Amino acid sequence: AQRPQAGTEKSDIPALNRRMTVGMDEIIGVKKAAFNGKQHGVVMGFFGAAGD
């Protein structure tokens, strides 16, 4: 919905540069494809990894 955009602000007094804030903002949504209660394109697999 919105690409990440940046912006800055002079907070306390713009003449007496005592404070400044930078920031970034985003509108996005991520979801796994699901139809009729089923995974659309993923096969999950569980294996025993010992981690030695």
Next chain:
Amino acid sequence: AQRPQAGTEKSDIPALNRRMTVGMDEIIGVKKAAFNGKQHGVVMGFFGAAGD
């Protein structure tokens, strides 16, 4: 480190001039000259002032 500088701000709404703040800022350091635990150029003297 910084001479005293002044600045102003329109706080609440810049259109509806309901509030304003002025201010002044400074960076400075003051210290008596001391070398090897001794006063460099002062001789302190204590006298009895009655204050009548």
